[PDB]
């Protein structure tokens, strides 16, 4: 889907020998909240003990990008499983939302490295400014004043007329 972010919090439900277990939290990227509560458990089983059934899910809440029309570069610290292959990457994308950059990373890994998405762990996701990005296909856009003439449109198929009388003509003037 489109992969919005959440904060899933978990406990280890306190048998009376232990009062008030220490409450870890996350930043999970997921299509929906039913799948964010098995990405919490997948990532925490690497880190602390307490699986489910022996833990609780305290509040999972969605976080709503704090500037949806400001324009910023997102660096994603990733690690994935290739065919021979656990690696780390640091990818950079350019977007407005932070769930929209993570989802622009889950396609790119599928395109470029064949990476079906169960292999990708996300470490960190930031909003790095500029003159901290490196990633030359993102530094293309870090200059006012940028021009680029367009060549891009739609060319309906068949059309509102399949057998046209007047030739689309990719160019004019």
């Amino acid at each position: 889907g489109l992969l919005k972010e959440y904060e899933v919090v978990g406990r280890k439900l306190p048998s009376e020998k232990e009062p008030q277990t220490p409450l870890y939290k996350m930043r999970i990227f997921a299509p929906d909240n039913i799948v964010a509560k098995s990405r919490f458990w997948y990532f925490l089983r690497q880190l602390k003990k307490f699986k489910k059934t022996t833990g609780e899910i305290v509040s999972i809440k969605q976080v709503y990008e704090t500037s949806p029309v400001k324009i910023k570069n997102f660096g994603i610290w990733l690690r994935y499983d290739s065919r021979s292959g656990t690696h780390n990457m640091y990818r950079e994308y350019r977007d407005l939302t932070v769930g929209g950059a993570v989802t622009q990373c889950y396609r790119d890994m599928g395109a470029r490295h064949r990476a079906r998405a169960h292999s990708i762990q996300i470490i960190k996701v930031d909003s790095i400014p500029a003159a901290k990005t490196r990633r030359v296909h993102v530094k293309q856009f870090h200059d006012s004043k940028i021009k680029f003439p367009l060549v891009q449109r739609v060319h309906h198929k068949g059309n509102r007329k399949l057998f046209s009388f007047r030739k689309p003509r990719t160019y004019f003037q």
Partner: protein, 159 residues
């Protein structure tokens, strides 16, 4: 230059195929090579991204900073006199004739088949006996030069 569609600020482009189809956005920043950040304050467009497929670029370029908020963009449409310029622009006229031709009530349809028929009768009459191969001569002079005598003489009839 040949100068194709410049993606700038603030090159006014009219949207073309999306949910904003028909409205005139400005362009304030370029997200990536495929998407810009469109914002038309005087035309019912809040600031939002847009895919550059569904945009068609006009010839107007207003001036604001590349990181401006919507009030600076709205201030610059007015100073350019862009609304008065756009509706008299060479083929925004052409937009509204297709909008006029669009879907065209049944009385207006069959009124034009009547009104084009009558000037078409007036236009096949103003047609096609030029200098070519008359004068001289056109024999017999009485009858195959009967009708054009009223173009020539004009009075009255050969005669």
């Amino acid at each position: 230059m040949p100068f194709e569609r410049f993606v700038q600020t603030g090159r006014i482009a009219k949207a073309s195929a999306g949910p904003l189809k028909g409205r005139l956005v400005a362009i304030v920043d370029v997200i990536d090579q495929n998407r810009v950040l469109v914002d038309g304050p005087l035309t019912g467009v809040p600031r939002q991204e847009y895919r550059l497929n569904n945009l068609h670029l006009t010839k107007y370029r207003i001036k604001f900073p590349y990181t401006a908020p919507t009030r600076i963009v709205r201030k610059a449409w007015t100073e350019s006199d862009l609304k008065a310029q756009w509706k008299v622009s060479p083929w925004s006229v052409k937009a509204q004739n297709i909008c006029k031709r669009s879907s065209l009530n049944d009385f207006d349809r069959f009124k034009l088949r009547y009104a084009k028929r009558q000037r078409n009768k007036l236009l096949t009459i103003a047609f096609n006996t030029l200098k070519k191969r008359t004068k001289a001569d056109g024999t017999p002079r009485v009858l195959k030069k009967d009708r054009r005598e009223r173009l020539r003489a004009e009075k009255a009839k050969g005669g």
